[PDB]
Amino acid sequence: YDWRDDPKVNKDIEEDIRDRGWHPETYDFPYTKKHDDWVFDVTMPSQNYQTDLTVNIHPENKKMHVMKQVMRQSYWDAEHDMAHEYDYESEDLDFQCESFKSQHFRKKGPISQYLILGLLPILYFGTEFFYNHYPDEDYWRVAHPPPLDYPDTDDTDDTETFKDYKSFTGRRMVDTGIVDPLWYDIREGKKVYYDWAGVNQPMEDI
């Protein structure tokens, strides 16, 4: 006996209210305990008052009793289960004994791995996309427009587009309205997108 394992003596053990009245360590395997039976005097009186004219039953006045927590599932005993399942190789005959206690009963174990089970979709998708950088390393990064005339004019065409917008034809097209207004301004060596463009400024070249 060790008081450290006794909840009554050891106050550091946090009792679980949802498991009150249920002790997995006391189960039979196979379970052969009766914990439910006829219950009266809660709402239905145990005595007889069918023909009592001076007594009327009021079920509304139900006195509160102790909460009946739902039965807790059995918890595994690691050493006992390992010994029970253990079989000696070239010493034991291959047979099943008459006693039913030899049945391999399933008992619940640690719940830690079930956290990873529950988070598996998040973990699996993260491994698929973020860990492997699928489809490419740039899809999940915050998007930044290319710097001014970067990487080359043939691809960027910022200066030519600016000149076209500032030209007579660009102004006339903007007036027609088929083409939207210019979205960036070429500052002193840098391109700055207007706040209404709804995009981030280009990343610095370092």
């Binding site: 006996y1 008081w3 450290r4 003596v9 106050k11 709402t43 079920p59 139900k62």
Partner: protein
């Protein structure tokens, strides 16, 4: 002691109390509550004579209700959400 068969005060975990947790006034209020939990019954102030209003000297019948409840209570404390009132109330919504 080293042996764990019987408990020893060396492992006792109880912090000493030096004063009320929330003040002497709070302690006095708690003591008064314990002494007169039911004997002291303050009530909100309401006028006792109103011309238009009719004093409520009796329990009113169900025919005075402007609204009909849907849920109900079993006499054993169970709360019924499915009731004949709900059955009749769900017909228009389901039809639509």
């Amino acid at each position: 002691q080293l042996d764990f068969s019987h408990f020893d005060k060396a492992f006792e975990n109880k912090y000493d109390i030096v004063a009320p947790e929330f003040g002497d006034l709070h302690q006095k209020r708690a003591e008064f509550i314990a002494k007169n939990q039911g004997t002291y019954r303050p009530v909100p102030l309401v006028p006792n004579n109103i011309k238009g209003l009719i004093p409520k000297t009796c329990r009113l019948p169900a025919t005075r209700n402007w609204y009909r409840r849907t849920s109900s209570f079993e006499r054993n404390g169970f709360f019924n959400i499915h009731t004949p009132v709900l059955n009749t109330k769900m017909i228009p919504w389901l039809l639509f």
